[PDB]
Amino acid sequence: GTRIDLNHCKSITPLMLSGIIRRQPVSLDLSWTNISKKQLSWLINRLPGLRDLVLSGCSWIAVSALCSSSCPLLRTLDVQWVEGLKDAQMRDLLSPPTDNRPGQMDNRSKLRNIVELRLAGLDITDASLRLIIRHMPLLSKLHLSYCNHVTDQSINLLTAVGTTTRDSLTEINLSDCNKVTDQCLSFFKRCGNICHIDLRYCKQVTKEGCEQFIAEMSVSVQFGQVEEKLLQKL
Amino acid sequence: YYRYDEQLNLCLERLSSVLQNKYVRCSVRAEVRHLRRVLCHRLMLNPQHVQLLFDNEVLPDHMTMKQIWLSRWFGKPSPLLLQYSV
Amino acid sequence: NPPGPEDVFEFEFSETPLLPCYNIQVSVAQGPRNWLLLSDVLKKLKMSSRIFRCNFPNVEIVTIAEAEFYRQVSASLLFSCSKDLEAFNPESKELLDLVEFTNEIQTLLGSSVEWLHP
Numbered sequence: 001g002t003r004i005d006l007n008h009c010k011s012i013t014p015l016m017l018s019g020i021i022r023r024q025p026v027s028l029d030l031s032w033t034n035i036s037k038k039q040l041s042w043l044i045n046r047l048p049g050l051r052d053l054v055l056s057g058c059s060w061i062a063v064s065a066l067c068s069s070s071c072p073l074l075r076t077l078d079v080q081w082v083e084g085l086k087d088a089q090m091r092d093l094l095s096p097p098t099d100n101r102p103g104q105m106d107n108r109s110k111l112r113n114i115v116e117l118r119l120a121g122l123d124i125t126d127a128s129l130r131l132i133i134r135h136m137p138l139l140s141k142l143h144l145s146y147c148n149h150v151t152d153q154s155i156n157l158l159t160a161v162g163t164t165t166r167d168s169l170t171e172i173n174l175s176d177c178n179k180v181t182d183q184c185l186s187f188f189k190r191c192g193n194i195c196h197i198d199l200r201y202c203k204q205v206t207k208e209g210c211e212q213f214i215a216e217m218s219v220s221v222q223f224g225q226v227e228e229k230l231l232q233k234l
Numbered sequence: 235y236y237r238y239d240e241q242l243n244l245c246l247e248r249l250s251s252v253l254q255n256k257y258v259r260c261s262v263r264a265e266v267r268h269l270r271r272v273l274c275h276r277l278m279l280n281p282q283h284v285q286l287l288f289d290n291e292v293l294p295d296h297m298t299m300k301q302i303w304l305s306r307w308f309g310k311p312s313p314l315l316l317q318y319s320v
Numbered sequence: 321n322p323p324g325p326e327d328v329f330e331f332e333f334s335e336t337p338l339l340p341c342y343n344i345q346v347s348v349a350q351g352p353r354n355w356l357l358l359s360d361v362l363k364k365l366k367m368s369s370r371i372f373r374c375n376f377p378n379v380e381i382v383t384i385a386e387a388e389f390y391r392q393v394s395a396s397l398l399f400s401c402s403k404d405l406e407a408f409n410p411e412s413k414e415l416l417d418l419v420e421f422t423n424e425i426q427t428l429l430g431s432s433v434e435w436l437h438p
Contacts, residue, residue, distance in 0.1 A: 011325065014322035035325075036325060237354075238352055238353055240396065241343070243341070255333035256335075258332065260331045260332070263329075272434045275434065275436075
């Protein structure tokens with residue numbers, strides 16, 4: 001594939017913007033840059049083939065560019081550690097865009113084709129998770145590490161009977177979530193296709209409960225602890 | 235607002251494609267960059283290969299038409315002559 | 321073309337030299353406006369006053385004292401050393417006919433009007 005990786009670039013020049021459009025990359029990473037809303041808008045309006053976008057640590061204002069019918073149907077979105085990206089902003093981001101042009105009939109989320117979503121560090125709650133569950137039927141890989149409002153109940157919602165996430169989720173990352181405990185493992189038993197559960201540095205999660213989950217699931221799927229509190233399929 | 239600004243008459247010559255409608259009127263508050271962009275729009279050119287000059291010297295982007303008049307055309311009969319290059 | 325990290329004008333284009341344009345406040349309510357001289361307009365349109373008023377009724381023609389015209393035009397720095405003023409009398413006892421400067425009149429005079437958005 002083709003990736004433009006300008007992570008930590010302290011100066012995104014017009015010449016760089018132009019060069020991005022010339023290449024039409026599959027993936028674009030502008031993490032930890034000062035990309036403006038104006039510049040990102042400019043880009044997404046000319047990158048119809050963009051699939052993976054990484055914006056970790058960018059301003060919410062810049063990120064808000066994606067709240068637009070111009071957003072392509074992204075496969076991957078990373079907005080870890082975006083300051084000011086909370087529940088209200090997740091709603092703008094995930095809900096159907098309200099700048100529809102009179103010659104457009106798409107009234108669903110422009111993130112509905114998301115397969116990988118990275119939200120680590122964000123100050124978000126179950127509200128935002130309900131939106132994800134509503135809008136993202138193909139969600140496979142979800143990163144919620146370092147999120148302080150992520151609880152066992154959160155996992156309950158994502159794995160609930162009725163949801164698309166129950167069966168679509170394969171990989172989930174809950175590293176150093178404080179409010180997650182061993183009982184989230186019983187909810188993960190509900191997941192037909194789960195193959196990767198990262199509970200590293202979860203203080204309330206025990207190697208004990210993990211070793212158990214392996215034996216209870218052993219019947220159908222063979223899981224192991226490549227390392228402690230990191231459950232993988234074999 | 236801008237509609238009711240004082241207006242300046244300009245004449246634009248190429249410095250060795252060409253502009254047909256070379257007499258221009260605009261607001262005294264219009265800047266070189268603005269004139270350069272509308273010029274480029276009409277001639278179907280990218281604003282990066284086009285420069286505005288006076289007395290064969292490039293004019294700064296942010297200089298207003300009034301500032302050109304005051305600095306280089308003071309009291310002189312209309313229109314104010316400029317040049318453009320590609 | 322591409323914006324940079326930290327980022328309503330009207331241009332008239334003519335093949336012909338443009339008529340002069342005067343910034344005059346006729347009424348306090350309306351405030352300053354741009355105007356052409358009617359006589360210049362008719363010269364360029366090769367047409368009598370009568371025909372012009374009859375066939376272009378939406379064009380605003382406004383008549384004021386020439387003296388008042390002189391007083392206001394001479395207040396402009398743009399007409400400070402103008403041999404254009406010379407053509408008028410500051411102690412005139414006469415009326416003077418203006419035409420409001422609009423897109424309509426620019427079009428009627430055969431110009432093309434370009435707009436700039438950011």
